[PDB]
Amino acid sequence: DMSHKEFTKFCYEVYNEIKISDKEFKEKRAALDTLRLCLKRISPDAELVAFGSLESGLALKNSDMDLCVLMTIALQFYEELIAEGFEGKFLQRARIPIIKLTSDTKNGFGASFQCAIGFNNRLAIHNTLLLSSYTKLDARLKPMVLLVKHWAKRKQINSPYFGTLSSYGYVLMVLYYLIHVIKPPVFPNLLLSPLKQEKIVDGFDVGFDDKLEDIPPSQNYSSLGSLLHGFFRFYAYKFEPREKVVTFRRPDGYLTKQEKGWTSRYILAIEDPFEISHNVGRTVSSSGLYRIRGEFMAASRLLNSRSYPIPYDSLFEEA
Numbered sequence: 001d002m003s004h005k006e007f008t009k010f011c012y013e014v015y016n017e018i019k020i021s022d023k024e025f026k027e028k029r030a031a032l033d034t035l036r037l038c039l040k041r042i043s044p045d046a047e048l049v050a051f052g053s054l055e056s057g058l059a060l061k062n063s064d065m066d067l068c069v070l071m072t073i074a075l076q077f078y079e080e081l082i083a084e085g086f087e088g089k090f091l092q093r094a095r096i097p098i099i100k101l102t103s104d105t106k107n108g109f110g111a112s113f114q115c116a117i118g119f120n121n122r123l124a125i126h127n128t129l130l131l132s133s134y135t136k137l138d139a140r141l142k143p144m145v146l147l148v149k150h151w152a153k154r155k156q157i158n159s160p161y162f163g164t165l166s167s168y169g170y171v172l173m174v175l176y177y178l179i180h181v182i183k184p185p186v187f188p189n190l191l192l193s194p195l196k197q198e199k200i201v202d203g204f205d206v207g208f209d210d211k212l213e214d215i216p217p218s219q220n221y222s223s224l225g226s227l228l229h230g231f232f233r234f235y236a237y238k239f240e241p242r243e244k245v246v247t248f249r250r251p252d253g254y255l256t257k258q259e260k261g262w263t264s265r266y267i268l269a270i271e272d273p274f275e276i277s278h279n280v281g282r283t284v285s286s287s288g289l290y291r292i293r294g295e296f297m298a299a300s301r302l303l304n305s306r307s308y309p310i311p312y313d314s315l316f317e318e319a
């Protein structure tokens with residue numbers, strides 16, 4: 001596949017600039033070690049588990065950590081963290097308690113050290129396991145994801161709290177495209193594999209075909225650049241967000257908002273692969289979607305240009 005040779009070259013150049021460095025990765029691992037030691041001061045029966053992009057390998061540089069305490073202990077842990085020189089925020093008695101660390105004054109992790117600690121979020125640990133497996137299955141997934149996250153941040157469409165979509169939402173859009181849209185598929189659907197076994201956690205089935213050594217290499221040989229152009233075009237022109245649901249629970253990837261009962265927030269519908277009652281795109285407003293769609297079209301138009309050379313830089317320019 002030489003169709004997108006120059007764009008692919010550019011993609012890997014940007015990828016190497018935005019990916020988390022080994023230095024920063026080690027630092028975050030070290031911060032996790034320190035925080036785990038602190039938790040074990042509170043309880044021998046509590047464990048501290050990393051999840052999210054750091055754990056899956058899908059992290060951009062200067063990333064925040066997402067951690068999870070598995071067993072409240074929340075208050076005791078928080079007060080102990082403060083005593084040990086961390087700065088942070090916590091609201092006691094919240095239905096979803098969260099400790100947000102914002103600074104470290106003693107343990108050398110930095111003035112701008114940022115870490116979110118939740119409690120018993122087992123589903124997030126499992127969806128991280130799923131994303132980790134996919135990143136191990138194909139070497140094109142990691143740079144594709146970083147580049148989509150970078151683009152989403154640069155174009156201001158990566159703000160759930162302000163009407164657009166979470167980074168996790170974008171990763172699911174990427175996986176859906178690579179499993180159920182592109183032909184030949186880049187990836188099989190591990191949840192729907194005949195070898196998958198049910199595994200019930202917090203009332204949902206988190207099972208998937210996880211024996212990766214038995215999964216053959218992809219029969220899709222497209223370049224990274226070809227994959228990304230295809231991804232942008234699908235969501236710009238082909239996907240029908242008014243009627244359709246991004247889903248990992250159908251063999252053909254076909255699911256309507258009607259069948260799902262997600263009609264009256266469901267402006268963009270992305271069904272979490274495990275917690276199927278959760279719409280990952282619940283944060284997306286009518287204005288947010290129009291802006292999201294507008295950016296997908298702009299990305300597609302850029303890459304479909306018949307001129308030479310194409311100014312690929314504009315893909316990651318702000319606004």
Ligand SMILES: O=c1ccn([C@@H]2O[C@H](COP(=O)(O)NP(=O)(O)OP(=O)(O)O)[C@@H](O)[C@H]2O)c(=O)[nH]1
Pocket residue numbers: 051052053054058059064066123124125127128158166167168169279280
């Ligand atoms: O709807 C959601 C969102 C997030 N998560 C879980 O939280 C993890 C992180 O979600 P995330 O959207 O924050 N990804 P992140 O890499 O931190 O980028 P960003 O915050 O924009 O800088 C995800 O990888 C999931 O494990 C969910 O389980 N459900």
Ligand SMILES: [Br-]
Pocket residue numbers: 052053058167168171
């Ligand atoms: Br993510």
Ligand SMILES: [Br-]
Pocket residue numbers: 233234237238
């Ligand atoms: Br198309």
Ligand SMILES: [Mg+2]
Pocket residue numbers: 121124
């Ligand atoms: Mg979560």
